[PDB]
Design a protein around this ligand. Structure first.
Ligand code: CL
Ligand code: CL
Ligand code: CL
Ligand code: CL
Ligand code: CL
Ligand code: CL
Length: 468
């Protein structure tokens, strides 16, 4: 992806986006109880913790585009992945407006707490001024969609979230885009049934983990990925995506039955128009993280990419024996023979992708079930029921999170969520976590689950049929 034109918003009539410059994250009551090194990401140029130029750092993931046609390797990769998606019978019929906005099976209701985007943010109009959970009203939304139309600019925000010491110093904060509520809605109507099918079918057929529930999904992953594991990381995946990958994504959707006009929303994601504070700018390529379906589309593109690199490097590869699960840029895969991921990374480099060893490793080492992570979690077979696998979020990450809060009024939900993650680390680690939480009075005012209750409910959850 690459920035192709920048101008002062005022020269084109756009008001300045007044995005917050101070973090909503504050030290929590547990900040002194636990240890951690993460702090709120830099959100402004003047931050005294900066040791690099902010604006440069944040826009630096737009490394450029490789200007290639869709090649032979890509074509066979698209064909192979479209073959799997076909078995799913994804409907390309538009999703009914109410289902798209207010919720339905496999597609939760449009989040009413995130940004309504442009022009709404400039007019003080919030999602809640247009939409209503209670009434399921759509009259105002339609007026809005008619008045302002589609293909509106995206609003660029810096993500307010915890980051490592090094990422704070380098100003390596992440950008997310707020699609206008009008474009979000039209995209959810166009691709909603695909979103739903993906959400209801995480695994090796969609090759996606988007919307999965790790507590349940983890036990399936080693059944799906039964050969020699493959895993690696990308650096700045989203912004590194060149248009050619979007061209491949468009071919894939057309094989699935979408019309050319329906895939036009892919051009909206690829060749995009943004407002960032007092600037207005155009970008060619790069997935604009935050718009409707970005995790799904990023995942689909990853499926095309990896197949492409294997076909390119291993001419004798048999893709029917390859398996992979992606969550955006995060991937866990397998093949019955060993595969040299450093080779794939060099092939990726020719395609404008930056792949590195898994987990900040220095070498494309062997990935084992002991060292593999996905969604940051390790895999550990239950001792009593070996066919059940615990998703293991490291205690270090749980500690980083508990030390800060964006709203202490939600302490109970925040802590309870962390407890659902923590117990997988074992009974002793869990009792220690609980003991430390209760070492401050707030900790004793909370309803925290018992380990035996967590374990029991986890074992029982595998008994109840799940719709696909
Ligand atoms: Cl600690
Ligand atoms: Cl944010
Ligand atoms: Cl799941
Ligand atoms: Cl990162
Ligand atoms: Cl080969
Ligand atoms: Cl299931």
């Amino acid at each position: 992806g690459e920035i192709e034109f920048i101008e002062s918003s005022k020269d084109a009539g756009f008001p300045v986006i007044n995005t917050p410059s101070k973090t909503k994250l504050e030290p929590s009551v547990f900040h002194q109880v636990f240890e951690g090194n993460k702090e709120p990401a830099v959100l402004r140029s003047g931050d005294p913790r900066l040791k690099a130029n902010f604006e440069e750092a944040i826009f630096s993931k737009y490394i450029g585009n490789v200007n290639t046609h869709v090649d032979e390797y890509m074509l066979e990769a698209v064909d192979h992945y479209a073959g799997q998606l076909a078995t799913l019978d994804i409907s390309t019929e538009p999703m009914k407006l109410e289902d798209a906005v207010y919720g339905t099976e496999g597609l939760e209701a449009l989040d009413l707490t995130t940004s309504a985007g442009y022009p709404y943010v400039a007019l003080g109009i919030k999602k809640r001024d247009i939409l209503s959970k209670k009434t399921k009203d759509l009259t105002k939304l339609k007026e809005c969609m008619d008045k302002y139309g589609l293909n509106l600019p995206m609003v660029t925000y810096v993500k307010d979230e915890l980051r490592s010491i090094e990422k704070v110093a380098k100003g390596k904060s992440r950008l997310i885009e707020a699609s206008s509520l009008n474009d979000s809605v039209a995209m959810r109507q166009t691709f909603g049934n695909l979103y739903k099918t993906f959400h209801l079918n995480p695994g090796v057929v969609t090759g996606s983990a988007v919307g999965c529930d790790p507590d349940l999904f983890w036990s399936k992953i080693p059944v799906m990925l039964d050969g020699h594991l493959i895993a690696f990381d990308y650096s700045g995946y989203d912004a590194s995506l060149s248009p050619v990958w979007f061209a491949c994504l468009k071919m894939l959707l057309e094989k699935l039955g979408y019309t050319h006009k329906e895939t036009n929303y892919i051009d909206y994601l690829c060749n995009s128009h943004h407002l960032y504070r007092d600037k207005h700018y155009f970008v060619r390529g790069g997935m604009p993280s935050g718009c409707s379906g970005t995790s799904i589309f990023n995942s689909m593109i990853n499926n095309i990419i990896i197949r492409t690199l294997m076909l390119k490097v291993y001419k004798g590869i048999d893709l029917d024996q390859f398996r992979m699960i992606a969550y955006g840029d995060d991937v866990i895969a397998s093949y019955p023979w060993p595969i040299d991921a450093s080779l794939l990374a060099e092939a990726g480099k020719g395609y404008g992708l930056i792949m590195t060893p898994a987990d900040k490793g220095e070498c494309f080492n062997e990935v084992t079930w002991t060292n593999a992570t996905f969604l940051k979690r390790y895999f550990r077979a239950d001792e009593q029921y070996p066919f059940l696998v615990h998703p293991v979020m490291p205690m270090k990450d749980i500690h980083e999170s508990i030390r800060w809060t964006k709203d202490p009024k939600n302490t109970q939900d925040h802590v309870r969520s962390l407890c659902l993650l923590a117990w997988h680390n074992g009974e002793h680690e869990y009792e220690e976590f609980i003991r430390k939480i209760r070492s401050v009075p707030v900790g004793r005012c909370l309803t925290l689950p018992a380990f035996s209750t967590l374990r029991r409910k986890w074992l029982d959850s595998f008994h109840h049929h799940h719709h696909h």
